[PDB]
Amino acid sequence: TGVQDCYRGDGQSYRGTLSTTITGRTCQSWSSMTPHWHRRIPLYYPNAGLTRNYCRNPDAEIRPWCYTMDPSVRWEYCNLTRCPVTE
Ligand SMILES: O=C(O)[C@@H](Cc1ccccc1)[C@H]1CCNC1
Incomplete structure (x- = not known):
């Protein structure tokens, strides 16, 4: 058996709810500009x-x-793994 949650390809299609990084940090909300100001927002x-x-x-x-x-x-x-391409 495989994992419950994973990404396919480069993961542009991923729409799961994982919200922790490879080091266990919590993801910042995309709509928030703190602690990091950024432009990866739906506007762009x-x-x-x-x-x-x-x-x-x-x-x-x-x-x-x-x-x-x-x-x-x-x-x-x-902290997300690639979905098995095969059995
Ligand atoms: O840090 C960022 O917001 C951008 C790069 C960026 C740095 C400075 C100015 C514009 C873009 C990264 C996030 C992951 N992919 C590119």
Whole structure:
């Protein structure tokens, strides 16, 4: 058996609710500008599902990511694995 939650391709299609980074930090809400001010917002990325603080990939990084709630760490890849391509 595989995982319950995972991304496919580069994860631009990911619409799950994972909200922690590879180091366990909490993702910052996309609509919030604190601790990090940014432009990965629906104004610029209207198709990308930038909702709550869920891991997403609006700008075609290699895998899903988020800004973090740690003021010293702007962004990280999320703690999300790639869905098995095969059985
Ligand atoms: O830090 C950011 O907001 C951007 C890059 C950026 C830095 C400075 C100015 C504009 C863009 C990253 C987040 C993950 N993908 C690109």
